[PDB]
Amino acid sequence: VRIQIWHQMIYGHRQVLAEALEKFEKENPGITVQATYRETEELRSSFQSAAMGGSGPELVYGPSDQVGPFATMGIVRPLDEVLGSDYFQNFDPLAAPVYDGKHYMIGDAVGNHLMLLYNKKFITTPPKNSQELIELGKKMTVDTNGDGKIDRWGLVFNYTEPFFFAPFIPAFGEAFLKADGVTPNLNTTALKDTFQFILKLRDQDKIIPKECDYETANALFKENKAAMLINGDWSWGDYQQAKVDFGIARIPMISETGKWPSPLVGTKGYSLNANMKSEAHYEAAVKLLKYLTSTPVQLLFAEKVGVLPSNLQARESDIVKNNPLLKISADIMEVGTPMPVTPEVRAVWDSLRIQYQKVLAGSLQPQAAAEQAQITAEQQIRD
Ligand SMILES: OC[C@H]1O[C@H](O[C@H]2[C@H](O)[C@@H](O)[C@@H](O[C@H]3[C@H](O)[C@@H](O)[C@@H](O)O[C@@H]3CO)O[C@@H]2CO)[C@H](O)[C@@H](O)[C@@H]1O
Ligand SMILES: [Pt+2]
Ligand SMILES: [Pt+2]
Ligand SMILES: [Pt+2]
Ligand SMILES: [Pt+2]
Ligand SMILES: [Pt+2]
CB 136 within 8 A of CB 123: yes
Which residues have CB atoms below 5 A from the ion given as ligand 2? Answer: 69, 343, 346
8 Å CB contact between 75 and 56: yes
Same domain, 255 and 361: yes
**What are the distances in angstroms from CA 35 to CA 21, 40, 354?**
9, 15, 31
Report the nearest-CA residue for atom 5 of ligand 1: 163
234 lines ligand 1 (CB under 6 A): yes
Do residues 204 and 254 share a domain? yes
Q: Whose CA is nearest to atom 6 of ligand 1?
A: 163
Which ligand places an atom closest to the C-alpha of 253?
4
Q: Is the distance from CB of 233 to CB of 309 less than 8 angstroms? A: no
CB 325 within 8 A of CB 306: yes
157 lines ligand 1 (CB under 6 A): no
Per the CB < 8 A criterion, the answer to whether 185 and 175 are in contact is yes
Beta carbon of 257 within 6 Å of any ligand 1 atom = no
Do 29 and 176 reside in the same domain of the chain?
no
Q: Which atom of ligand 1 is nearest to the CA of 13?
A: 18
- Residue 263, classified by CB atoms within 10 Å of its CB into exposed (0-12), middle (13-18) or buried (19+), is buried
Do residue 92 and residue 221 come from a single domain?
no
Q: Is the dihedral of CA 349, 352, 355, 358 positive or negative?
A: negative
Q: Is the CB of 216 under 6 A from ligand 1?
A: no
What distance lies between CA 366 and its chain's CA centroid? Answer: 25
Q: Could you tell me if 29 and 149 lie in one domain? A: no
**Same domain assignment for residues 221 and 132:** yes
Question: What's the per-residue H, E or C state across the chain?
Answer: CEEEEEECCCHHHHHHHHHHHHHHHHHCCCCEEEEEECCHHHHHHHHHHHHHCCCCCCEEEEEHHHHHHHHHCCCECCCHHHHCHHHHCCECHHHCCEECCEECCEECEEECCEEEEEECCCCCCCCCEHHHHHHHHHHHCECCCCCCCCCEEEEECCCCCHHHHCCHHHHCCCCCECCCCCCECCCCHHHHHHHHHHHHHHHCCCCCCCCCCHHHHHHHHHCCCEEEEEEEHHHHHHHHHCCCCEEEECCCEECCCCECCCCEEECEEEEEECCCCCHHHHHHHHHHHHHHCCHHHHHHHHHHHCCEECECHHHHCHHHHCCCCHHHHHHHHCCCEECCCCCHHHHHHHHHHHHHHHHHCCCCCHHHHHHHHHHHHHHHHHC
What is the CA(94)–ligand 5 centre distance, in A? 9
One domain, residues 215 and 349: yes
Ligand 1 center–CA 26 separation, angstroms: 32
Regarding whether 319 and 365 lie in a shared domain, the answer is no
Rounded Cα distance between 236 and 13, Å, is 10
**In this structure, which residue's CA is closest to atom 13 in ligand 1?**
40
Measured from the Cα of 44, ligand 1's closest atom is: 32
Q: Judge residue 200's burial from the number of C-beta atoms within 10 Å of its C-beta, 0-12 exposed, 13-18 middle, 19 or more buried.
A: middle
Q: How far apart are CA 31 and CA 16, in angstroms?
A: 19
For 297-332, b/e burial (b = at least 16 CB within 10 A) is bbbbbbbbbbbbbbbeebbebebbeebebbeebeeb
Q: Give the count of domains, the chain.
A: 2
257 and 274 together in one domain: no
Residue type, 191: L
Question: Do 189 and 282 reside in the same domain of the chain?
Answer: no
169 and 244 share one domain:
yes
Q: How many CB atoms lie within 10 A of CB 132?
A: 15
Q: Are 80 and 24 in contact (CB under 8 A)?
A: no
What residues make up the domain containing 331? 1-113+263-340
Q: Do 118 and 228 belong to one domain?
A: yes
Closest residue by Cα to atom 9, ligand 1, is: 63
